[PDB]
């Protein structure tokens, strides 16, 4: 059913089109949430949507855009909270 997924992404992922990439793929799957740069150069993605869509997004996130180098994605799922009206990047 509907879940929230948290993913923290490590690698070369800031400055490289990653957040926009996430966003575009989240929109195509009807997923809401955000992606945010963190102070250590990692990117946090919070996504809410159906589990199968969240799994497809996570397969894209493990892939990343051309300039990026996604080395590790630590992710969990948890209860859907319905906090988001769109997918934003911060
Ligand atoms: Cl797609």
């Amino acid at each position: 059913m509907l879940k929230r997924m948290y993913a923290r992404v490590y690698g070369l992922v800031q400055g490289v089109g990653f957040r926009k990439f996430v966003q575009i793929h989240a929109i195509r799957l009807g997923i809401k949430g955000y992606a945010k740069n963190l102070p250590d150069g990692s990117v946090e993605v919070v996504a809410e949507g159906y589990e199968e869509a969240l799994s497809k997004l996570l397969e894209r996130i493990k892939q990343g855009p051309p300039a990026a180098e996604v080395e590790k994605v630590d992710y969990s799922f948890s209860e859907y909270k319905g906090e988001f009206e769109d997918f934003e990047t911060y």
Side-chain angles (χ1 to χ4, degrees):
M1 174 61 67
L2 286 172
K3 289 192 182 298
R4 161 180 297 210
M5 175 174 76
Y6 291 105
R8 175 82 171 258
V9 186
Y10 298 86
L12 177 65
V13 292
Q14 292 184 190
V16 296
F18 188 69
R19 284 184 295 181
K20 294 169 199 173
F21 175 91
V22 183
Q23 183 174 43
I24 288 297
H25 279 293
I27 292 172
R28 283 169 66 78
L29 301 174
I31 281 168
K32 308 180 162 330
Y34 67 87
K36 178 160 188 186
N37 288 153
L38 293 185
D40 64 335
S42 79
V43 163
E44 177 94 17
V45 173
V46 179
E48 287 200 328
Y50 292 92
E51 181 168 353
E52 156 248 78
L54 291 171
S55 300
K56 282 188 185 101
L57 178 67
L58 170 71
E59 284 187 320
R60 291 302 196 194
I61 283 167
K62 295 174 158 177
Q63 168 210 126
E69 163 92 81
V70 174
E71 303 169 5
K72 178 187 223 347
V73 186
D74 280 342
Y75 67 97
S76 45
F77 287 89
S78 65
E79 289 185 351
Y80 172 86
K81 292 303 261 129
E83 182 177 308
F84 310 112
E85 180 109 21
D86 55 10
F87 201 96
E88 287 165 331
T89 55
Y90 296 115

